[PDB]
Amino acid sequence: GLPVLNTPGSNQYLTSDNYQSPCAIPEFDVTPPIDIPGEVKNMMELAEIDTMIPLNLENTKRNTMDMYRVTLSDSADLSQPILCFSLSPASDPRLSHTMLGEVLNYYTHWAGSLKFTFLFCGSMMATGKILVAYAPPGAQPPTSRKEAMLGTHVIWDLGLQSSCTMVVPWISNVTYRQTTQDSFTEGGYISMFYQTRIVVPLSTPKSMSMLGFVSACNDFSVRLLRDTTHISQSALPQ
Amino acid sequence: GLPVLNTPGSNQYLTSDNYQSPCAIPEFDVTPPIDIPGEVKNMMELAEIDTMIPLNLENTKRNTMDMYRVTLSDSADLSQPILCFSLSPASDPRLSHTMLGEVLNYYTHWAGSLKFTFLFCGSMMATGKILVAYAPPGAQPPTSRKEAMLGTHVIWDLGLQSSCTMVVPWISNVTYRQTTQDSFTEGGYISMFYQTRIVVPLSTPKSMSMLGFVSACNDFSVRLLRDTTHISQSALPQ
Amino acid sequence: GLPVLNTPGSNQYLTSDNYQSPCAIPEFDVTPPIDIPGEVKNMMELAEIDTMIPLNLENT
Amino acid sequence: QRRSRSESTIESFFARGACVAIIEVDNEEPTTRAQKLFAMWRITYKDTVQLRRKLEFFTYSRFDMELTFVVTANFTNTNNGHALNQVYQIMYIPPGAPTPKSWDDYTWQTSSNPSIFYTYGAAPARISVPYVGLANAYSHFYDGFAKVPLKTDANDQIGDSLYSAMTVDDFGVLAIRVVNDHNPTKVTSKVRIYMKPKHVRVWCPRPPRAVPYYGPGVDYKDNLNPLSEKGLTTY
Amino acid sequence: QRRSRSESTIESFFARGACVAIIEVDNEEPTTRAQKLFAMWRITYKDTVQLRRKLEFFTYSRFDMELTFVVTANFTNTNNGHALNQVYQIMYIPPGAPTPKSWDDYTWQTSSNPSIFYTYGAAPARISVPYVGLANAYSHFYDGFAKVPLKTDANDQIGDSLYSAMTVDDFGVLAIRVVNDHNPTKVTSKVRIYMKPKHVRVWCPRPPRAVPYYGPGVDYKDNLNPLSEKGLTTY
Amino acid sequence: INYYKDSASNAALQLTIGNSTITNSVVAYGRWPEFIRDDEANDQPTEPDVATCRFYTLDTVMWGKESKGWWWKLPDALRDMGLFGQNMYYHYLGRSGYTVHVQCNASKFHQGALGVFAIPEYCLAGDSDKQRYTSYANANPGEKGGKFYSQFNRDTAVTSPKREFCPVDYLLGCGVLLGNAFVYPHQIINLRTNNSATIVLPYVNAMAIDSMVKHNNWGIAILPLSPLDFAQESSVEIPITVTIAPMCSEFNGLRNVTAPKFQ
Amino acid sequence: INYYKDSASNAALQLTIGNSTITNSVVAYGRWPEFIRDDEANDQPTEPDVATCRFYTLDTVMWGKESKGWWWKLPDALRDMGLFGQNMYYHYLGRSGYTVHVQCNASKFHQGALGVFAIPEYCLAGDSDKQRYTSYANANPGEKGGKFYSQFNRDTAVTSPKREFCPVDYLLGCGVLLGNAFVYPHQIINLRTNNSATIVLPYVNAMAIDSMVKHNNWGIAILPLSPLDFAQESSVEIPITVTIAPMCSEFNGLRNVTAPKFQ
Amino acid sequence: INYYKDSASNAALQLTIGNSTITNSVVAYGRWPEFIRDDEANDQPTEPDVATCRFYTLDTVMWGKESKGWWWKLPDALRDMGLFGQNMYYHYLGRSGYTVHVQCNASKFHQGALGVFAIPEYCLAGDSDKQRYTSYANANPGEKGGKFYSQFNRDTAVTSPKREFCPVDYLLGCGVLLGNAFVYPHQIINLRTNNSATIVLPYVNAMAIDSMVKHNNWGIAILPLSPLDFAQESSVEIPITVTIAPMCSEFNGLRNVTAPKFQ
Ligand SMILES: CCO/N=C/c1ccc(OCC[C@@H](C)CCN2CCN(c3ccncc3)C2=O)cc1
Ligand SMILES: CCO/N=C/c1ccc(OCC[C@@H](C)CCN2CCN(c3ccncc3)C2=O)cc1
Ligand SMILES: N[C@@H](CCC(=O)N[C@@H](CS)C(=O)NCC(=O)O)C(=O)O
Ligand SMILES: N[C@@H](CCC(=O)N[C@@H](CS)C(=O)NCC(=O)O)C(=O)O
């Protein structure tokens, strides 16, 4: 018949190949689809949904509801930070298990800006001011308000607004950052401090709780699909 | 020659494949066909032909002519049902061996409406009224005329008409129902009751027989061809 | 190269098959034919010729 | 859209390869006693029951055929060495053609009979055949005889014939042999034949079989109680 | 240019072959005691966890499937000779079809059930399947029962059913056997099945699993402390 | 694209007939009997018009409480009916359609139901372990016909086997449930509504024309779907009559007469 | 170029409803409830307009410092609400959307936060080693609903197993971290800003219409994201109320009434 | 014809700058320094114009008969030069080109030749068996620079390894013959013809902008191609001076100041 020549790679099975195969059930009447609410076209759409951050991962509070709450008080040390973490969406323990982190753990490279939100759950009579700062990598991590203010910072007034949003923009030497811990693709640091203090009147609680959320913006992209480390198996079903 | 690359599935035999093969008898003068009555184009055409139902499957009557007859009398208990069964065309023993059931046993999924017919074989002087009811699944199977009448019911007058027809329409949550017994794809129940009673004059038989038939309508379809359980083999011919 | 899939019947030899094969003597000058009497196109032509019947098949 | 009847067509209903024959062939040193060096199988679809039952839904049929051959070989002992890859020969013998009497007689020259040579380990063999019926359609059921006894017949055996049989030898046979010579160790092999009808037309539908088959005809011997017990007023 | 989201699509996210089943089949001399001559596997994707976890990101799905089969065989001893190349038969049995009781019963005729015959040493087998869901979409999660108990039921077992289960027998099974007869030496083999969804649509995204799976349902038994320790004010 | 040349390789009221008159009808497969067309043949046919296409009445039978059924074969039943039989035995090839009329009359105080079925290529089962051993004489009873049975009585004779059929009523004599016999052309006679049945059968066979002596084209089966009863009498019997009219009959292959040996 | 025929082979304010009135809203998936369209069906449906589409109020619950959460199932919670339940039990197939309103009022000196989540196909975990062994009665509490727990308490009974759910607050009762529960339709009630929440749920299922008795389409989960406190008091309790209004409800398959056995 | 979708599968004088003035030039790769274009970026950059783009003079070195060579790293050498260093340490990302001017004057009775080479990604070899063990402090000498050697002196310390470079003159300190070093941008100062050299270096890197602290973009190497001599004197020494001017410098990522630990 037609002369042919077999090339390398013949009779191999590549799990990522895209070829045609015969159908074992020809002439099948497929049930037509219907319009079901909640259709999803891209996985990034899930990364754009805000989800809570387990900020408090202490030994006696992790794996418990209280791990989602950060305590605030009117008698706290104003010279010390309220919370601090690193801009590692997929490797930081406080961000790895979020929906953004769960989606990222299936990919090797990521790029884009991020959005952080903070919700104050005190009484209507409580007032105060807070400072939320982001610092790009390269220098010592901030330990005081004076150092933090030199970065990208936002001032939040609790009384007027119960929620605050800060956008961390994309700034990097490389076009894409790895999803694993690596000093060559470090992202920066996030810190919080008191601006003036929490002030409350009499017959009012002196302690309150705060919540945090994270999400991705519309300029977020991922590369290089890969397996995750968050699920394992030891014995196959019998 | 022409470079080529062999893909997975090469040199395999799939019984449902559709490929070309060489002919072992080239240049054969095939005998032309003729117009023979009774040509069949679709198997559903056979399912649309009415066939008798072995309603009476008692121990001493099954596998015998009497299994196709249902007894009626003028001294019967009017508060008890005459006959009862389930809308399982392929798994119910009383419907599995019908032509519809035989065709369905070769397929895995079915959908469509059904038509049931009842023939009264009494004397011309006998009169009476009957009620034939269908109940969709979900509630207790009917045990009395009061419960049955709440469903889809038809009233049949023996004197005016010796035959009655009831159409069970298609009503289901799923688009297709399985041909095997399954509570998630249950079809419903079929029952019969006396409306007034059988009345006969003197010098006339007081007992009579009734026959039943089933068929499929024009909106009937099947899916997923498969082997049947009605034929088996133990030893190959020697 | 071009993806392909091998089907059943590959590498089999059917005596009634009709395929192309390479020529072992390329560029051969074939002797031209001539008009020879008695050319036959169909075997039925031989069946249309009358022939004697051995009617008497006795032992002797 | 609305539900379709694409898969209930005659073509789809018969678009499956069904086994119709298992044949045994052995390779060993020839001996005086009986052996299985070559085998002959009479072509038909009544050896198995599934395809037979599916086809018997109708009285008359007209179709082409596709045949596929799957070969599986094995050893029997371990102390007689091994063997090299074998080649199998399958020949179609129509009625009237000479039949082999040995695995290496002249009949295997297959000057005019088609033949297939199969090398073990390759893809299963395959061929196609057209409609070769003498009449305008195949007759699954035949209510008649091939001979009619006459008053003038010398004896009653002149006109005796089997009921519901057209021809004694129909469609020929298939002869299977191993071309290779015998190795010091015996090697057994089985050939499985799968049939698929194509371009199928049918006439005169009939009710399906309800009791186990018994012979090529419609005879029944045992298991004549198919239906099971069930209550009259039981759902 | 600007960064794209080509690889984050649903199709790309599921464009990978994932193992879903490892099945064992043995060839040896049949004996009275239990053996692994033929095997039956119930079709599902919950035997493994990676594909299950990826699919459980959404509540409803609709896709076609591609299946690939990889076969690996080996010996067990050394003093019983050797064996010739084997042929494996894989048959799909939908619900309601008869199931085999032996490696050589009539059910293997596969008159209507599709089957694959694979020759050892060739390329891994492959097939494709369309969407065969009874409803308009597959239901990964089902919050309900198949039966409802009633006050008039004679006993409590009439209406008893497992929670979060639609049908007991869904999608049928796959039966795998070795067609070849038994050699004097036993031969073991494993078949690995890899699944790839195609033409995928999804609805109602859900949060991913955070603790080890336990059974077909959403039950959890052990390892309920996923998060690790970390300082509140530690970078 | 198709590569191979061969296609097989390609991947996939009063009715009057003749001098007879009888005073709704069913047409089998919706096909009226017709003569052979010029586009299908194999000499000059002989086509009697009125000397053979007329109603012939068979022997009357009796239906009672213990009756199980009756069966006949065509054209076997008409082998001795006027000139039709003479033409059948004087010609090698024959063809014909049929009209079947079943008569059974009763009163308004009787009750019962008869099912009449026309079956093409109606093959019956034997009565012995040997397969397809039935004799020609036993398979062609004639106008008398045969009867059904409710059980399979195996023949115990070893010296002189009977070689006869053993039809079973609920298996239709061929191993198929009677309930599905309605797939064939059929009629129902219910004593409370009607008293007669009529069917029209065209010529059906794999060949345009075939021998009538060694092959039977049609079978007629009559079975009681409901038992006969009358008032409260212990014994009841009524007559059943059958009439058959050939239609559009052709004959070919004239030669000396055939004389089959019927016992 | 595609070779095979099959596609699979191809390579890849006041709101008033009915006679009820309540004095921003969230629409789930941005889809308002709607009736079935003519291009999707399987008889004449029954579509009550005002006799069933109205607000029904459930039993009030109490929120304190030790409260962990509550959950309800729909349409289970409305099985005994006026004519809606009667239509549910008198028909084989049902369909409906919902409007959920959560009310909780406090003072300016209180503090706390509630999270309300609507979950489609909300499946909960058991309380025993056996898998999927929960009973129908325990899985359908009704309008009373259930409660969450902070730890997994395995059932030690071997003779009379309870067969009940054991939801865990931080796992959402299904093995997923609570922080991601916001992926579902949700609302937050913060006592310092608002005192009520509203959600609109369309009909979601793999089928256009399905039975309401054996399958629950929606689940409602309310959890305290922040603990309740008031001034410096040791004990604080406030009421929480839930109201639900069916919308665009259809029923089909009329027959006798269903009577499930709830204990 | 290409079958696969992916492309990869497809088969294959006075110069014044700022407030500084110096009284032919060589442009590396024929590319003048330029600012980042709008079609390539990753916030608002900071682009000093005259406060950082000006000539800074390094410490003078001495060339004699036994001198083997000198080397410097950029932007390391300018880390403590006015506001350029402050901007370098106050920003995460930086970018800049350079202008290098080498001055060395002698008399007509002197003789010698200097080769100046600008090397991108100039990596030097260590002085120990361990690989890539050089310390940050030793790899960034600053404005003082380093010197070459004529032989490889392996470090014998085992307790306190020096962790320093050991460049070799004839191997260019990187294992390549010096004769081919002219492949890089280069200049030759021959005392009998000229007394100065000038080079212009654009920004070269795999990324548009990168950190200046942890990565050095350029290296400058000066080696004596011919030994220095004067009349018949035994000892001769002359000064060599280096001046560097940043050009088109951009900075981004403002935050607190970085304080590296240099010993
Ligand atoms: C080199 C070997 O290849 N030759 C193969 C071959 C295969 C089949 C051939 O035809 C055999 C006959 C088939 C067309 C099927 C015959 N059928 C159709 C009708 N029929 C049958 C049997 C018994 N009762 C009624 C009908 C059959 O058995 C001829 C040659
Ligand atoms: C000759 C052998 O080839 N036959 C092969 C074959 C393969 C697959 C076939 O379909 C099996 C069902 C699949 C389409 C996948 C079923 N899925 C989709 C939804 N689902 C599932 C399971 C458990 N909970 C929820 C959903 C499944 O397990 C049919 C035939
Ligand atoms: N080592 C185990 C079997 C290991 C096993 O089956 N592992 C599963 C998951 S726990 C698997 O994914 N195996 C992949 C493979 O080896 O093919 C045994 O034989 O006792
Ligand atoms: N086990 C039997 C043979 C079994 C057999 O031949 N079975 C037939 C039908 S009863 C069959 O379909 N076999 C399929 C196959 O094994 O290839 C024996 O060897 O004694």
Pocket lining: D92 vs ligand 1, CB cutoff 6 Å: yes
Does residue H45 form part of some domain? Answer: yes
The total of structural domains in chain F comes to 1
Nearest Cα to Cα of residue D179 among D82, D38, D80, D83 = D38
Please give the DSSP secondary-structure letter assigned to residue E75.
Answer: E
- Pair E141, E46: CB distance under 8 Å: no
Resolution limit, Å: 2.5
Q: Are chains F and H in touch, 3+ Cβ pairs below 8 Å?
A: no
Give phi and psi for B227, each to the nearest 5.
-75, 155
Residues 6 or more apart whose CB falls under 8 angstroms from that of G18 comprise G50, G53, G54, G55, G245
H/E element, B45: helix B44-47
Name which of F139, F212, F222 is nearest F178 in CA terms. F222
Q: Alpha-carbon distance H61 to H70, whole Å?
A: 9
Q: Which of E81, E90, E130 is nearest to E114 (CA)?
A: E90
Closest to F92 (Cα-Cα) out of F263, F261, F257? F257
Pairing of strands B2-6, A4-6: parallel
Which has the closest alpha carbon to A99: A227, A230, A188? A230
Residue A119 bridge partners (DSSP)? A163, A211
Contact G141, G58 (CB under 8 A): no
Contacts of D230 in chain B (CB under 8 A): 57, 62, 93-94
Strands G15-17 and G20-22: antiparallel
Q: Which two tokens stand for residue B34?
A: 């003729």
Angstrom distance (rounded) from CA A33 to CA A56? 45
Closest to F56 measured CA to CA, from F253, F249, F258 = F249
Does an H or E element contain B88, and which?
none
Ligand nearest to the CA of A231: 3
The count of domains in chain D is: 1
- Which residues in chain B have their CB less than 8 angstroms from residue F194's CB? none
The candidate with the shortest Cα–Cα distance to A26, out of E174, G47, E112, G255, is: E112
Distance (Å) of CA A9 to CA A3, A22, B5, C2, E18? 19, 21, 7, 11, 21
Element (H, E) at C54: none
C-alpha closest to that of H126 among H158, H72, H173: H173
Angle at D41 between CA D39 and CA D43, to 5 degrees: 160
How many domains is chain A built from? 1
How many C-beta atoms lie closer than 10 Å to residue H83's C-beta? 12
User: Which helix (H) or strand (E) segment is E50 a member of?
Assistant: helix E50-55
Minimum-distance ligand 3 atom for the alpha carbon of A235? 10
Q: Quick one: three-class SS letters along chain F?
A: CCCCCCCCCCCCCCEEECCEEECCCEEHHHCCCCCCCCCCCCCCCECCCCCCCCCEECCCEEECCCCCCEEEEECHHHCCCHHHHHHHHHEEEEEEEEEEEEECCCCCCEEEEEEEEEEECCCCCCCCCCCCCCCHHHHCCCCCCEECECCCCCCCCCCCCCCCCCCEHHHCCCCCCHHHHHHCCEEEEECCCCCEEEEEECCCCCCCCECCCCECCEEEEEEEEEEEEECCCCCCCEEEEEEEEEEEEEEEEECCCCCECCC
Q: How many helices (H) and strands (E) does chain C have?
A: 1, 2
CA angle at B18 for the pair B17 and B23, rounded to the nearest 5°: 120
Kind of pairing, strands H91-103 and H196-201? Answer: antiparallel
> Where on the phi/psi map is residue B236: left (φ > 0), alpha (ψ -120 to 50), or beta?
beta
CA distances from residue D134 to A76, A109, D131, F123, H63 in whole angstroms, order as listed: 105, 72, 9, 22, 113
- Residues with Cβ within 8 Å of E110's Cβ and at least 6 positions away in sequence, in order, are B15, B227, D16, D17, D18, D19, E91
Asked if residues E134 and B185 have their Cβ atoms less than 8 Å apart, the reply is yes
Residue F65 resides in a domain: yes
CA distance F176 to D210: 5
Give the torsion sign (CA, D50, D53, D54, D60). positive
φ, ψ of residue D10 to 5 degrees: the values are -65, -45
Q: Cβ(B235) to ligand 1 under 6 A? A: no
Distances (CA, A) of A234 to A37, A160, A218, E227: 37, 53, 39, 20
Q: In angstroms, rounded to a whole number, what is the distance separating the alpha carbons of residues H193 and H112?
A: 11
Q: Distance between CA atoms of A130 and E226, rounded to whole angstroms?
A: 32
Judge whether F27 is closer than 8 Å to chain B, CB to CB.
no
Core vs surface per residue A120-131: b (16+ CB within 10 A) or e: bbbbbbbbbbbb
Q: Rounded CA gap, B13 and D16, in Å?
A: 12
Please name every residue paired with F20 in a beta bridge, in sequence order, or none if there are none: F17
CA F228 to each of CA B73, B209, H52: distance values in angstroms, whole numbers, following the listed order: 16, 11, 122
- Residue H94: which of H259, H225, H245, H205 has the closest Cα? H205
Number of CB atoms found within 10 A of residue F157's CB: 9
Report the amino acid identity of residue E148.
V
List the F110-120 sheet strands across, edge first: F146-147, F70-74, F218-230, F110-120, F186-190
Q: Residue H181, SS3?
A: helix
- List b or e across E120-131, with b for residues whose CB sees 16 or more CB atoms inside 10 angstroms: bebbbbbbbbbb
- Rounded to the nearest angstrom, the minimum Cα separation between A177 and chain G is 24
Q: Is D90 in the pocket of ligand 1 (CB under 6 A)?
A: yes
Residue G75, preceding peptide bond in cis (omega within 30° of 0): yes
Cα H211 to chain centroid distance, Å, stands at: 16
Q: Is D189 in a helix, a strand, or coil?
A: strand
Please give the Cα distance from E7 to A106 (Å, whole number): 11
Q: Which two tokens stand for residue G189?
A: 């009630």
* C-alpha span between B3 and D180 (Å, rounded): 35
Distance from CA of C9 to the nearest CA of D (A): 5
How far is it, in rounded angstroms, from Cα D89 to Cα D176? 6
Q: How far is D149 from chain B (nearest CA, A)?
A: 31
Q: What one-character DSSP code corresponds to residue H29?
A: G
Report the C-alpha dihedral over residues E200, E204, E209, E214, rounded to 10 degrees.
-80
Rounded to a whole number, what is the distance in Å from the CA of B122 to chain F's nearest CA? 5
Cα(C12)–Cα(D68) distance, integer angstroms: 12
What residues of G are in contact with residue B173 (Cβ under 8 Å)?
Answer: 42, 93, 207, 209-211
Query: Can you name the residues that pair with A190 across neighbouring β-strands?
Result: A85, A134
What is chain E's Cα-based Rg?
A: 23
Q: Which of B184, B219, B191, B214 is nearest to B113 (CA)?
A: B219
Q: Can you tell me which atom of ligand 2 is nearest the CA of E138?
A: 19
Q: CA G5 to CA G10: how far, in whole Å?
A: 9
**How many beta-carbon pairs below 8 A join chains A and E?**
172
How are the residues of chain C apportioned to helix, strand and coil, as percentages rounded to the nearest 5?
Answer: 5, 10, 85
How, if at all, do strands H110-120 and H196-201 pair?
Answer: unpaired
Peptide bond into F75 cis (omega under 30): yes
Dihedrals φ, ψ of D200, to 5°? Answer: -95, 130
Name F102's bridge partners.
F197, F242
My answer on whether omega of the bond before H75 falls inside 30° of 0, hence cis, is yes
Segment 201-240 of chain F within 8 Å of chain D by CB: 204, 206-208, 213-217, 219
Q: How was this structure determined?
A: cryo-EM
Buried b (16+ CB within 10 A) or exposed e, B154-174: eebebeeebebebebebbbbb
Three-state DSSP state, A33:
coil
> Is G134 within a domain?
yes
- Of the CA atoms within 13 Å of residue H11, those in its CB half-sphere come to 7
Chain center to CA of F229: 27
What is the domain range of residue D141? 1-235
Residue E81: other Cβ atoms inside 10 A: 18
Across C17-53, b (16+ Cβ under 10 Å) vs e yields beeeeeeeeeeeeeeeeeeeeeeeeeeeeeeeeeeee
The annotation places the binding site of D at 104, 109, 177, 192
Quick check: is H23 in a domain? Answer: yes
Q: Which two tokens stand for residue G208?
A: 């256009």
Hey, are the CB atoms on G204 and A124 less than 8 Å from each other?
no
- Out of C4, C9, C14, whose CB is closest to B4? C4
Domain annotation covers residue H199: yes
Residues 6+ apart with CB under 8 A from F63: F104, F112, F114, F224, F228, F237, F238, F239, F240
Give the three-class secondary structure for A149.
Answer: helix
N-to-C CA span, chain E: 35
Domain containing residue B138 = 1-238
Chain-chain contact of D121 with E121 (C-beta, under 8 angstroms): yes
Q: Does D11 touch chain F (CB under 8 A)?
A: yes
**Using CA positions, which residue lies closest to atom 26 of ligand 1?**
D140
- Which alpha helices (DSSP H) does C1-60 contain, by range? 44-47
Q: Give the DSSP letter of residue A62.
A: T
Ligand nearest to the CA of A227: 3
F2 assigned to some structural domain: no
Distance CA G81, CA H120 (A): 81
With contact defined as beta carbons under 8 Å apart, do B180 and B91 qualify? yes
Ligand 2 pocket test target in E171, E196, E198, E200 with most atoms within 8 Å of CB: E171
Name beta bridge partners: F219: F73, F119
Which residue minimizes the CA distance to atom 17 of ligand 2?
A: E44
Q: Within 10 A of A197 (CB to CB), how many other CB atoms are there?
A: 15
Cβ contact C14–B5 (<8 Å): no
Residue E96 to residue B226: CA distance in whole angstroms: 8
Q: Which residue of B has its CA nearest to F202?
A: B37
Task: Compare all CA atoms of chain C with the CA of D109 and give the residue at the minimum distance.
Answer: C15
User: Got the DSSP string for B134-154?
Assistant: EE-BTBPPP-SHHHHHTSEEE
What does DSSP assign to residue D198?
E
Interface test with D, best of E28, E29, E79, E84 (most D CBs within 10 A): E84
Ligand 2, atom 25, residue with closest C-alpha: E140
SS3 string, chain G, reads CCCCCCCCCCCCCCEEECCEEECCCEEHHHCCCCCCCCCCCCCCCECCCCCCCCCEECCCEEECCCCCCEEEEECHHHCCCHHHHHHHHHEEEEEEEEEEEEECCCCCCEEEEEEEEEEECCCCCCCCCCCCCCCHHHHCCCCCCEECECCCCCCCCCCCCCCCCCCEHHHCCCCCCHHHHHHCCEEEEECCCCCEEEEEECCCCCCCCECCCCECCEEEEEEEEEEEEECCCCCCCEEEEEEEEEEEEEEEEECCCCCECCC
CB atoms within 10 A of CB G214: 20
The continuous run of DSSP H or E covering H123 comes out as none
For residues A21 and B12, give the distance between their C-alpha atoms in angstroms, rounded to a whole number.
11
Amino acid symbol at B184: F
- Residue H75 · residue H86 · CB < 8 Å: no
Of residues G111, E11, B148, the one with CA closest to residue A158: G111
Q: How far is CA D32 from CA D29, D35, F108, in A?
A: 10, 9, 81
Q: List chain A residues with CB under 8 Å of B223.
A: 28-29
Residue F182 to residue B51: CA distance in whole angstroms? 6
Q: Which residues of A touch B172 (CB under 8 A)?
A: none
Does E3 count as an annotated binding residue? no
Encoded amino acid at D14, one letter: F
Sequence-ordered strand ranges (E) for chain A? 4-6, 39-40, 51-52, 70-73, 84-86, 107-111, 114-120, 129-135, 152-157, 163-168, 177-178, 189-194, 207-216, 221-225
Instruction: Name the phi and psi angles at A144, rounded to 5.
Output: -150, 160
Closest chain E CA to residue A81: E233
Question: Taking CB atoms and an 8 Å limit, are D125 and C8 in contact across chains?
Answer: yes
H248 with H34: CB under 8 angstroms?
Answer: yes
The answer to whether the CB of G246 falls within 8 A of the CB of G79 is: no
Is residue H4 in a domain? no
Q: How many CB atoms lie within 10 A of CB A232?
A: 10
G5 within some domain? no
CA distance D132 to D122: 30
- The angle formed by the CA atoms of residues E176, E178 and E184, to the nearest 5 degrees, is 145
Q: Do D136 and B111 touch (CB under 8 A)?
A: no
Neighbouring chains to E with at least 3 Cβ pairs closer than 8 Å: A, B, D, G
